[PDB]
Design a protein around this nucleic acid. Structure first.
Ligand SMILES: Nc1ncnc2c1ncn2[C@H]1C[C@H](O)[C@@H](COP(=O)(O)OP(=O)(O)OP(=O)(O)O)O1
Ligand SMILES: [Mg+2]
Ligand SMILES: [Mg+2]
Length: 425
DNA sequence: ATTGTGACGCT
DNA sequence: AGCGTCAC
């Protein structure tokens, strides 16, 4: 009724860089632009592992987590850029620095939460109020939304359809009310057009975006029309959108929890969740998950956009698969040193840029044949940015896993050093 | 031999 | 604290 809150209080956007690592390499190397091309890590085992794919290459079936030799079977003219290698491992610095370029531009418009190297949430509520009082009541022109899709429209040529749906949306709009959620979302979309234009002008990079009333819907919306487009998901669009939406497509339901929702309740689509009471969902999935599911299948989610532009952790990882697994003490020490030297470099740069110091060192390892992705995770004190000290401390922390009598067994298939617990400096 | 990250929850 | 989940 009148007291049923509808989750329409905020305007939230999710901005995701289109095939980001590919775009970084295409900016640097113009011969790669507007071509089927991918970014690969390493090169010896089956041509290297593909970690990013241009849309031209995706059209041939090339995907992430495919070996380059196999991708070339699907796409013989595929062009490749290789991740930089330093100290014997992939080094992602070029892409982190490109990400900072983009995040700093986004921060001019609004508060952002860095969700990953190429994705950020945007809290647009106050920016929209400012822009609405700036409008002082005139309507919003289609010309202000040149790359926006309105999900669910038109109802009742891809670009022609986009424009039909946008016209239907704008003709319906009630610009009289500075508190209409649909109007607020529309102004949000105008601002995100401007943000995306600024990113492309000032970096060369293109991105897609979603605009809705919360983070989950904004991320879902972002996925609906890619690349280089943005999508508005209104509250009213949720029943139809969710009526055929697989549960696994909603952020956080792509794993075991979503699988159990499907199996326990005997449903397939998000919208089917509305039939259950909050207490029923809590009985199957716990108090927190159940309340979250009850609201989310109605389009309602409360998770705030956190004011956080910088990562909370600075980590360095390397897998040693198959016969490259580490089998001697010297090997383990040398790779701990390699990881620690990259970590020291990134930490010293982080301290200069961002006025903070990490205080905890996490050391994690995998042992051969262990079913888990991480076998062991132990922490120690991080007191100075010294690679030799950090590597000696990581070894001191993990050495009691060695069961032998200069040899290391069982061989180690992953090493991981992470700097955490930052404090202002 | 589907890597190298990074965020968050549980107990 | 250490382990597990989730999403790229
Ligand atoms: N599993 C992974 N391993 C390594 N790097 C990854 C992985 N997933 C994503 N990345 C990196 C490379 C991507 O360019 C970047 C952004 O990831 P993501 O947003 O899913 O895809 P994308 O930006 O390449 O394409 P899209 O246009 O679909 O967003 O992060
Ligand atoms: Mg992306
Ligand atoms: Mg992304």
């Amino acid at each position: 009724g009148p007291h049923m809150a509808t989750g329409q209080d905020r305007v939230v956007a999710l901005v995701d860089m289109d095939c980001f690592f590919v775009q970084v390499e295409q900016r640097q190397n113009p011969h790669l632009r507007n071509k089927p091309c991918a970014v690969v890590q390493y090169k010896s085992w089956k041509g290297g592992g593909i970690i990013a794919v241009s849309y031209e290459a995706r059209a041939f079936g090339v995907t992430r987590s495919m070996w380059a030799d196999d991708a070339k079977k699907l796409c013989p003219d595929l062009l490749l850029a290789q991740v930089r290698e330093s100290r014997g491992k992939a080094n992602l610095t070029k892409y982190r620095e490109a990400s900072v370029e983009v995040m700093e531009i986004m921060s001019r418009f609004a508060v952002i939460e860095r969700a990953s190297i190429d994705e950020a949430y945007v809290d647009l509520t106050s920016a929209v109020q400012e822009r609405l009082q700036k409008l002082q009541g005139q309507p919003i022109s289609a010309d202000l939304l040149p790359s926006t899709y309105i999900e669910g429209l038109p109802q009742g040529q891809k670009e022609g359809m986009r424009k039909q749906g946008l016209f239907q949306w704008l003709d319906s709009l009630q610009i009289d009310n500075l508190t209409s959620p649909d109007l607020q979302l529309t102004v949000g979309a105008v601002i995100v057009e401007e943000m995306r234009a600024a990113i492309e002008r000032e970096t060369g990079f293109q991105c897609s975006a979603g605009i809705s009333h919360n983070k989950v819907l904004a991320k879902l919306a972002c996925g609906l029309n890619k690349p280089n487009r943005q999508t508005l998901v209104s509250h009213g669009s949720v029943p139809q959108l969710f009526s055929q939406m697989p549960i696994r497509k909603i952020r956080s339901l792509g794993g075991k929890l979503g699988a159990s929702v499907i199996e326990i309740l005997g449903i397939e689509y998000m919208g089917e969740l509305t039939q259950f009471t909050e207490s029923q969902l809590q009985s199957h999935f716990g108090e927190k998950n159940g309340s979250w599911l009850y609201a989310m299948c109605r389009g309602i989610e409360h998770d705030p956009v956190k004011p956080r532009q910088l990562p909370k952790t600075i980590g360095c990882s390397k897998n040693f698969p198959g016969k490259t697994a580490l089998a001697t003490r010297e090997q383990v020490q040398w790779w701990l040193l390699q990881l620690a030297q990259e970590l020291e470099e990134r930490l010293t740069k982080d301290r200069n840029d961002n006025d903070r110091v990490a205080t905890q060192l996490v050391v994690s390892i995998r042992v051969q044949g262990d079913k888990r992705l991480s076998s062991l995770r132990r922490c120690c004190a991080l007191t100075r940015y010294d690679a030799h000290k950090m590597s000696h401390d990581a070894f001191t922390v993990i050495k009691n896993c060695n069961t032998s009598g200069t040899e290391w067994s069982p061989p180690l298939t992953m090493l991981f050093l992470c700097a955490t617990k930052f404090s202002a400096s």
